Amino acid sequence: TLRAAVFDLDGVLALPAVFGVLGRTEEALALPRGLLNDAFQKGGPEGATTRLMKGEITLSQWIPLMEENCRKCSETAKVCLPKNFSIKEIFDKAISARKINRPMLQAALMLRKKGFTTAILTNTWLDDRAERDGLAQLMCELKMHFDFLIESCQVGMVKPEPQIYKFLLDTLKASPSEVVFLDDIGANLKPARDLGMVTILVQDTDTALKELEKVTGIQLLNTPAPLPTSCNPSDMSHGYVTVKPRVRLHFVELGSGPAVCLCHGFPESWYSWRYQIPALAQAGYRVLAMDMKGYGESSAPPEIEEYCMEVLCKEMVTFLDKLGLSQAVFIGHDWGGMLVWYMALFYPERVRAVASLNTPFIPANPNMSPLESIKANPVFDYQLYFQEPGVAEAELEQNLSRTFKSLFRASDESVLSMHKVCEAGGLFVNSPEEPSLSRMVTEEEIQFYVQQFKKSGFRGPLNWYRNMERNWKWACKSLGRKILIPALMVTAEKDFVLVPQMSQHMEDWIPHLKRGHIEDCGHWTQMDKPTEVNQILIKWLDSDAR
Amino acid sequence: TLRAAVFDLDGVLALPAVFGVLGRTEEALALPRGLLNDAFQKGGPEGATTRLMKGEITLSQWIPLMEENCRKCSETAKVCLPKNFSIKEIFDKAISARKINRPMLQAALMLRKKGFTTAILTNTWLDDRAERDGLAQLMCELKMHFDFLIESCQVGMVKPEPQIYKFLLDTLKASPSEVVFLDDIGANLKPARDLGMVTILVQDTDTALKELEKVTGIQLLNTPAPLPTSCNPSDMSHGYVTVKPRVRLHFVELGSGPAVCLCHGFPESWYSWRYQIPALAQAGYRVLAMDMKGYGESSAPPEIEEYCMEVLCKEMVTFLDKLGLSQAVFIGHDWGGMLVWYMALFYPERVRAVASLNTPFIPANPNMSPLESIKANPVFDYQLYFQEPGVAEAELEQNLSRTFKSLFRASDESVLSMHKVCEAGGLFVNSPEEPSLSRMVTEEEIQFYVQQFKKSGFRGPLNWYRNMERNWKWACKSLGRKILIPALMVTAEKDFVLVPQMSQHMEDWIPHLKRGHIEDCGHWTQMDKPTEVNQILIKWLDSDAR
Ligand SMILES: CNCc1cccc(-c2cccnc2)c1
Ligand SMILES: CNCc1cccc(-c2cccnc2)c1
Numbered sequence A, B: 001t002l003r004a005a006v007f008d009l010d011g012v013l014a015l016p017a018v019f020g021v022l023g024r025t026e027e028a029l030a031l032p033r034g035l036l037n038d039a040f041q042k043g044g045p046e047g048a049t050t051r052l053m054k055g056e057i058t059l060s061q062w063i064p065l066m067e068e069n070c071r072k073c074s075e076t077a078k079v080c081l082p083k084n085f086s087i088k089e090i091f092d093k094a095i096s097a098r099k100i101n102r103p104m105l106q107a108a109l110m111l112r113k114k115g116f117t118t119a120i121l122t123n124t125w126l127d128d129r130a131e132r133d134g135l136a137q138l139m140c141e142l143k144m145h146f147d148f149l150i151e152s153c154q155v156g157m158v159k160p161e162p163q164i165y166k167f168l169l170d171t172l173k174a175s176p177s178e179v180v181f182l183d184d185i186g187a188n189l190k191p192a193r194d195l196g197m198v199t200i201l202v203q204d205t206d207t208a209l210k211e212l213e214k215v216t217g218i219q220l221l222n223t224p225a226p227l228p229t230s231c232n233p234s235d236m237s238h239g240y241v242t243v244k245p246r247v248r249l250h251f252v253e254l255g256s257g258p259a260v261c262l263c264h265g266f267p268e269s270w271y272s273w274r275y276q277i278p279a280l281a282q283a284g285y286r287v288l289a290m291d292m293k294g295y296g297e298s299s300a301p302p303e304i305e306e307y308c309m310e311v312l313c314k315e316m317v318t319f320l321d322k323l324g325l326s327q328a329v330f331i332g333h334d335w336g337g338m339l340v341w342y343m344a345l346f347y348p349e350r351v352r353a354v355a356s357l358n359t360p361f362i363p364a365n366p367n368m369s370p371l372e373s374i375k376a377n378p379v380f381d382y383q384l385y386f387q388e389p390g391v392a393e394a395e396l397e398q399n400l401s402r403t404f405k406s407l408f409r410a411s412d413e414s415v416l417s418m419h420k421v422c423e424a425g426g427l428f429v430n431s432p433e434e435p436s437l438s439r440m441v442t443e444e445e446i447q448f449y450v451q452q453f454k455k456s457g458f459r460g461p462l463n464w465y466r467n468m469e470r471n472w473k474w475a476c477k478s479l480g481r482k483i484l485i486p487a488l489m490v491t492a493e494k495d496f497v498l499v500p501q502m503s504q505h506m507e508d509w510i511p512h513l514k515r516g517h518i519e520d521c522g523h524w525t526q527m528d529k530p531t532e533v534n535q536i537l538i539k540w541l542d543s544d545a546r
């Protein structure tokens, strides 16, 4: 039966209702009860407020009309308005107080996830106030979660006029009996009900949601915590910058405010940050989520030395130079974590702050060859297995789906020991042909990785592991320095390759290092514990990069 | 003979020299003459400063070494340092005082324009101070103008060590006698001279430039005012956003700070803003220079109504939604000017501020059809000529080079009257086959337009002119509103189509409108008077959009 759900903005998706500040203001100021509402509604379908709601005039033009109205109401009720009474002030304050009503948004999201078409239908105004940006931000955040946003001032019609409902129905490509409509004003529900829509009168949120649950047959209340918002690749702005003749870097870009450059690990993608990108943009950052060199839509030259840290870092500086960015905050995971530490040591003037997930900062040992260092840790055996050009490429390219499905697994789901890989003859030699799907990833998300890696395969990616000696010699140049810009290290309790204890000496080199630690989190940190990652990065960004 | 010119940063490309603050500080504080220089140089090739300049330690690690040095020098000279004496403070202040020495930069630019290879060779440090961004910005601004930037702390070598000069020569792919080297420290010149480089000792800038002129044989002093910096397309970050299934918008993006969306006119390109893009980014803005729908690398669907203002504006809102931008400053020229006024009237919550070049804001007349309004002005006759699908496309596509060469002309160069175009049978009927090249444009710049327009031709572009009735009906919805967000109108004295007097009533609708006016400027404003446009936009941005 029901296929569509329609929510109002004031008093339903957003609270406190701005309508409601008339009531509060009368109470706070000891005015005659309803005086401000009388003024707000004066003239009815031909008064100032209706012309505003229909888009005939803007909010700033309406303000002095309401003011006049407030005077007229107070004269006929034989009172005075307080010295300094200000409609502009009252409304600035109420529009900024009003916030997304999170449980109602999450119900709309869940219904949309079960197949509902969702819409916002609202009587609202053209906002040209000095502070309009606050409302623009609220609308942006809400509207990406709905199929349609219908605004009275854009369509020239207002609730309760019957034409707006017919316009709704026609927008929804739905008959009225397939629709549930929620509003906190009973007069606004009435024409929907006359057409045989299910309607819900919203006073407190929980009761409305109980009625909504009952009538749709879907669980909306007491539901577990949902995942952060993810990214749909074809909805992103995609950027491309040529950093030298055969090397162009692709990135996805969302948000405004301080530039934050996200650098993924092996064998990954910009898409590995899909849960961080909307959260960090929504927190007030300009996010640039890279395809690192060798991956996705970035160039992937075959030569091994094109992937040494020195070359990669110099390219990332060029990337900032071409974008006209004097700095970015650099956040990396895995190989990208290693990269951002080297950015901080060699280009601190370009790094506003630095954060790594999983990858520790360990100074090079000038008295031991890196390949021997590597041979000393049984869990890095797979790194020796990666050395010989063509061997790991053949195994990893042989069946991409099985490759990402076998790699991307939560800590309780493993099919790969990283144990004696060379001796085993490969990474997947004792893994199934058809792994089950991790709880972390959908089959669609796997096929996105699979399609990215069809372009250039694993040569470029593996090459990141093939510059151990060259990276060691470059790193030895930096052994006298410390990292003294703002820095965060995020350890993952159950990453059994990049273990939290490997980071334990970092304060000797980064004395003011901050930390976060994520329990029950494997190697694929951003997608294993996306909620916790987001919280830790935004806290650290707002305190240290701001 | 000479093919290459090498400049130092401190005291040559940038002034006052930070070295020089030791002198000034001793004088200001009544310290023993040379005390701070003695401390700065203590230990010579093995002291703190040399390790800094070679990249062994960072600036923040060096600060307390210099401090110690300052104490030791003052003890052996039997004096005290003042209470609150601060090396950090002295250096923060000196590094921010130091600015690009504009006449020396413009000499380097001019030599580069006559074929020199140019480089900056500098002893400098790894800057990890809280205020490092100021230096990062200076280096970014300078370095885009040179072939190479060689920094002591990146290469592990310092002037005057002879290896740094050999490294220079090898970088320049030049023998020493082809090179002129300028430095303000004679000891730093000596190894260059030993190799037979021409050297110039820089004290005052003018004298150095006279020697530079003499030895290169090129005029560098008293030279006319150069054009602002332009854009090279293959050096830009190129962005792409799908705003609906068959419509993706391309843009070029440079800079950080408030988003500024530049919207070009007919029949133009993002490249028409090539002189504004670096200037506005350099002024502290995030510039987004669009290919408008129908142009360049943006989609160009054939249908006429895809190009009505309502559809175009709704798309531009979607473009901001997908980029995660709650607002942008919108600056338009010509058709793009018309568009940004409609953005301000219909989406003021998304428009931080609005500026138009040439295009006035004239409310629709609800009592006259727009086509009759158009017939009333003899200079808009070419707009009737554009109505019939396929006619103007055939003339404008027939020879692209002749098309842009005939259109893009300064006010003293015209070959087109816009007079009785329909009756003439076309736009170019009485223009030459091979127009001369305008002073405004190079043959390379013309061929960039020609190559852009080979992708989709003139159908999409002309379609912008084919929605007069549809745009009029939409505009009539807005006749009750005023524009009350910050707004700038820039008139062009010699634009004989979009004449300055057409804007004379705009204050009735935009009572707080600001203005700029450009004399001796034709229709192609950004490329006719790029210096004046830049100055007018940056002044207005910094006061009204900031
Ligand atoms: C460590 N750099 C990325 C990488 C390379 C190879 C394997 C794994 C992996 C695979 C499974 C579990 N944990 C980690 C991770
Ligand atoms: C007015 N919209 C752009 C346009 C269209 C057609 C011709 C010209 C033009 C051509 C020459 C001189 N001045 C203006 C300009």
Ligand SMILES: [Mg+2]
Pocket (backbone or CB within 6 Å): A008, A009, A010, A011, A012, A183, A184, A185
């Ligand atoms: Mg309501």
Ligand SMILES: [Mg+2]
Pocket (backbone or CB within 6 Å): B008, B009, B010, B011, B012, B183, B184, B185
């Ligand atoms: Mg110098």
